[PDB]
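## tool: complex_structure
## caller: assistant
## args:
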Amino acid sequence: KIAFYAGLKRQHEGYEVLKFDDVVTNLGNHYDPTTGKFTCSIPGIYFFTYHVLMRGGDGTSMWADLCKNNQVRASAIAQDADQNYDYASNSVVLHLEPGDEVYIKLDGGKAHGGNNNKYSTFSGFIIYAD
Amino acid sequence: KIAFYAGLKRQHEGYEVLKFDDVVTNLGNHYDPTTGKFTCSIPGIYFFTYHVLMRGGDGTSMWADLCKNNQVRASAIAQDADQNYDYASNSVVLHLEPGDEVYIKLDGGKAHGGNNNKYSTFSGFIIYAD
Amino acid sequence: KIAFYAGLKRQHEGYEVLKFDDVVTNLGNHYDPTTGKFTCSIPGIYFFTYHVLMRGGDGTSMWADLCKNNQVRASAIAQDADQNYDYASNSVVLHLEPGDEVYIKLDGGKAHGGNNNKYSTFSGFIIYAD
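## result:
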């Protein structure tokens, strides 16, 4: 059984892997909140989704991408000229090999740092094992 | 087999459980459109997702949270200074026990009341049984 | 095994089926990038999700709906008075019969044409077989 769901506890900005550290579900401990990475243990087909809230009242654009190893597999942007809250969100279905790392990367701009309110999230689960 | 998908038929505002009453899928009848609640029947791991459209032309912020019993498990905001339509959406993976109730709560602001167009939605399914 | 994920390679506008032609996953080849349609091969219960990015700097509203055959099953709008990027996104769980076609239709407005960056996406997988 492989599934996880975590939220962002702190605010972040710039270009970095987002460490979702408010962990709600983590079957098999394949998601690591100290790195923000899900590491594949079984070859197969996996679903992932993310929702990253842009900071409000400070900035107009924010990008958040889902990556596999060093490669973008989905991109998203939040943008609002009046500096309103808005989301960069996307979903994927990927084939993974053992060792592959899946994570969300901030690619410019500012992310809201909810404490335990889980505004910004990352989840995933295996659909098929090879 | 446990899975459901429903849309909002009427417009709502304030602080209340959203009753998605345009039911498209409801395997096992574990979602109740008269309460807006999914009730767990089997201990296990469940995926849920929601997309709630803020009313356009009347208001600037709207919040919608996914709850388990009396506890927030995901939060979302829609915000636009020019009163444009925008979405409060999120997704989760949760462990549930029989009797647990999962639902979307409006937490301030105004939600669009599509009739049968299914702009605002709530869906879920079991991933694993314990 | 039935699952797929694809992104939009080109920009589109108006009223047309969106052809997600940047195919990442397509188990069983049930998604056709030349038509934009997923065709059901097995009766059962299926999850789909989509995220369509509105073009920035040219227009204020865009609609994108998920359809089954000739019927809307989910609707979404992106809207921003300052012509900012924003998303029309939704998710569904549907019962399908063999031959049923599921696709995303642009229903007015302008969609961003990312090349291989996968800003705009469509994915799905079977949950249950009848």
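## assistant note: Chain B has one domain: 1-130. Chain B touches chain C at residues 1, 3-5, 7, 24-25, 27, 49, 51, 53, 56, 80, 82, 84-87, 89, 91, 114, 117-119, 121, 123-125 (CB under 8 Å). Handing back to user.
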